[PDB]
Amino acid sequence: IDLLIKLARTMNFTYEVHLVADGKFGTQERVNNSNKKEWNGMMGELLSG
């Protein structure tokens, strides 16, 4: 958080910190319910938008 505040002042951007839905990091997690696989956790949220 302290490092993040430093970047915001330097590059002049605003933010709104929010937590993650499921307390897990990224993982490929290939499953049979989908075609090949889909990202889960923090990593999937970044790609979703």
Binding site: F13, Y15, L19
Partner: protein, 387 residues
């Protein structure tokens, strides 16, 4: 000893200038056995009427090709569908024109359907190259939920998957556009301003009207759009900065058929070979066997070369389509069309007139915009991020 050509035209008046067109067919290259007959009928009101009228008149003369064109009434391609089935099952060649649809592209059903006019789905090629000179990086596109609409999306995603990092959004909408607005504000958050539309004639005007109350047609936007939504009722309710497309010889069949007939005649000279040239089945009162020499010259027919008519470069690819056709990019301003460029397989831009853009701005507006506020995620780790 007699080579026959069959065709179906639009009107009885169109049956008057046909004989003028076939008059010069005999006086052509060689004419070893080129002795034609009229072999033409009109467009039946019903598809079932056209279904059994193909054999009784055109096949009765034992023709070796069929010419199909759009009916005078702007309906849903009433002419090609009955021909493509009866003649297709007989493996009889058919030449198409004035019908540009993506349904007659896959060879799963319509095995033999070659046409010079490119389909509506081929417009995607000009969109990519046009934005290259203007240096437009990433785009968002709107596609009607239909096979015709979905074909353009497939072509685009095989072209910007190797030389580009895909598109920002591929959001889609139902053809029954009724108060279609809920997805507009979704598009008005990614800062692209370079949206692309490929809908039909009727629904395109609905999108423009839905884009009016949300100031979606203001300055800083560029609308790279297709062809059909410039005419019809889509002419009204449209912004003043459109970049629509065009075809040089669209809706013209008198010159096309004269150019098309000769291409068949050139391929006839290659038919006479060591293979049997047995006449196709006579009539259709009774017959079950399918002749074998039909598919034996489809490659010959599709590989023909003919330097006369339109651009003198009528070359047929694996599908039914010409090569390096001319589109001649249009432009719209104050309820009037105007030419601002020509496309001949490569990007060509003459000075012509200064390009106008939506919102009244006379300069070229870059579509990119940047949002300072951005969302951030974090996790619960004790020494790093307390909660």
């Amino acid at each position: 000893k007699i080579v026959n050509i069959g065709a179906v035209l639009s009107t009885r008046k169109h049956e008057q200038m046909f004989r003028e067109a076939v008059n010069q067919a005999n006086k052509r290259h060689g004419s070893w056995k080129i002795q034609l007959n009229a072999t033409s009928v009109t467009h039946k009101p019903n598809a079932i009427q056209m279904a059994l009228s193909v054999c009784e008149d055109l096949i009765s003369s034992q023709v070796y090709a069929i010419l199909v064109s759009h009916p005078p009434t702007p309906n849903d391609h009433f002419t090609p569908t009955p021909v493509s089935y009866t003649a297709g099952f007989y493996r009889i060649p058919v030449l198409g024109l004035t019908t540009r649809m993506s349904i007659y592209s896959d060879k799963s059903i319509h095995l033999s359907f070659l046409r010079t006019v490119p389909p509506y789905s081929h417009q995607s090629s000009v969109w990519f190259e046009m934005m290259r000179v203007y240096s437009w990086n990433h785009i968002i596109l709107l596609v009607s939920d239909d096979h015709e609409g979905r074909a353009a999306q497939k072509r685009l995603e095989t072209l910007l998957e190797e030389r580009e990092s895909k598109a920002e959004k591929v959001l889609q909408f139902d053809p029954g556009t009724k108060n279609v607005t809920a997805l507009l504000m979704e598009a008005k958050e990614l800062e692209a301003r370079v949206i692309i539309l490929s809908a039909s004639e009727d629904d395109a005007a609905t999108v423009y009207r839905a884009a009016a109350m949300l100031n979606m047609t203001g300055s800083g936007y560029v609308w790279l759009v297709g062809e059909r939504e410039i005419s019809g009722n889509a002419l009204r309710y449209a912004p003043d900065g459109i970049l629509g497309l065009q075809l040089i010889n669209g809706k013209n069949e008198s010159a096309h058929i004269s150019d098309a007939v000769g291409v068949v005649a050139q391929a006839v000279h290659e038919l006479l070979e060591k293979e049997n040239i047995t006449d196709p089945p006579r009539g259709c009162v009774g017959n079950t066997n399918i002749w074998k020499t039909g598919p034996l010259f489809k490659r010959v027919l599709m590989s023909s070369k003919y330097a006369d008519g339109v651009t003198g470069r009528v070359e047929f690819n694996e599908d039914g389509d010409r090569k390096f056709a001319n589109y001649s990019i249009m432009n719209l301003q104050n309820r009037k069309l105007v030419q601002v460029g020509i496309y001949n397989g490569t990007h060509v831009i003459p000075n012509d007139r200064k390009i106008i853009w939506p919102g009244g701005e006379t300069e070229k507006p870059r579509g990119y915009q940047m949002s300072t506020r951005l969302k951030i995620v974090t996790i619960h780790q004790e020494p790093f991020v307390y909660v």
